[model samples]
Target: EAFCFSDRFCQNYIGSIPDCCFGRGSYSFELQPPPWECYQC
Candidate 1:
């Protein structure tokens, strides 16, 4: 699986810092995951 369901795989996938991809109302109007998901890349 490209994106699996395990803590080890998702550890680096979730965020560099928890909630790094989110903030107040950031995820609200999205039809998809926020832009911060792949920000640094």
Candidate 2:
């Protein structure tokens, strides 16, 4: 599979880092898994 399960992969694909308001700060919004599955095995 071309897609890997990781923050780097997600970012390279369609990533988004969100930042909370007030006392919050920047953090990983959602490290979602591959849309389907991993066939790189």
Candidate 3:
């Protein structure tokens, strides 16, 4: 119910050891930010 790497030096530098699924019934996957970067020509 706890495990995090690939962002805290868990070896691999940036490869394997990549997985997520937090506790609290489970719902660990979000990155909804950046509604707008640049638009209009």
Candidate 4:
């Protein structure tokens, strides 16, 4: 499932190809770095 411009150089259609979940992904909600007594201010 990949095609980065190459349908007659996109002139034959395919100008926007980006739907692999929108790429560039990063997720982390922490799990062990918040046990210091909840960091009491």
Q: Per-residue lDDT of 1-41 in model 1, one digit per residue for the tens?
A: 12211132123343234344333222212223344432232
Clashing pairs in 2: 1-39, 1-40
Model 2, C-alpha of 19: deviation from truth (Å): 31
Candidate 2, residues 1-41, lDDT tens digits: the string is 13232333333332232222222211233344443332211
Tens digits of lDDT, candidate 4, 1-41: 33222222222222234542133321112221233312211
Listed in order, each prediction's TM-score against the native is 0.16, 0.16, 0.16, 0.16
lDDT of each: 0.29, 0.29, 0.23, 0.26
In candidate 3, stretches whose alpha carbon ends up further than 4 angstroms from where it belongs are 7-41
Instruction: Write one digit per residue (lDDT tens) for candidate 3, span 1-41.
Output: 12322332222122222344221122112222122311111
Q: lDDT of candidate 1 vs native?
A: 0.29
Total backbone collisions for each predicted model: 0, 2, 0, 0
Q: Candidate 1 versus the native: TM-score?
A: 0.16
- Best lDDT among the predictions, by candidate number: 1
Candidate 1, residue 3: how far the Cα is off, in Å: 15
